[PDB]
């Protein structure tokens, strides 16, 4: 049947981000730009995947962009594989 629930959980998040940042159309540039430092790994090597950087940094930047809304970074925590509790 194929698992794409968590895909849609990502969609719903991005769509929420895009819907709340209507006053701020600029965030849609810089948000992903920061995660592009993360995601780079997959295309950077000629072989294995990596971690990118420290998961704390990619967080750190996005927080300054989004600032005021802690509830978004709450959902960001899903996409950070830490402990899972």
């Amino acid at each position: 049947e194929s698992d794409s629930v968590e895909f849609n959980n990502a969609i719903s998040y991005v769509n929420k981000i895009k819907t709340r940042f209507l006053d701020h159309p600029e965030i849609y540039r810089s948000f992903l730009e920061i995660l592009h430092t993360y995601q780079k790994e997959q295309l950077h090597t000629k072989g294995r995947p990596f971690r990118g950087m420290s998961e704390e940094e990619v967080f750190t930047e996005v927080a300054n962009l989004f600032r005021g809304q802690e509830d978004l970074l709450s959902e960001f925590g899903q996409f950070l594989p830490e402990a899972k509790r």
Binding site: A10, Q78, F79, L80
Partner: peptide
Amino acid sequence: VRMNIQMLLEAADYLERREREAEH
């Protein structure tokens, strides 16, 4: 279970393309 930050760049490019799909 593939919930990594990779999903955000996936969901973003997906959603960009989705708007353009919708117009027809």
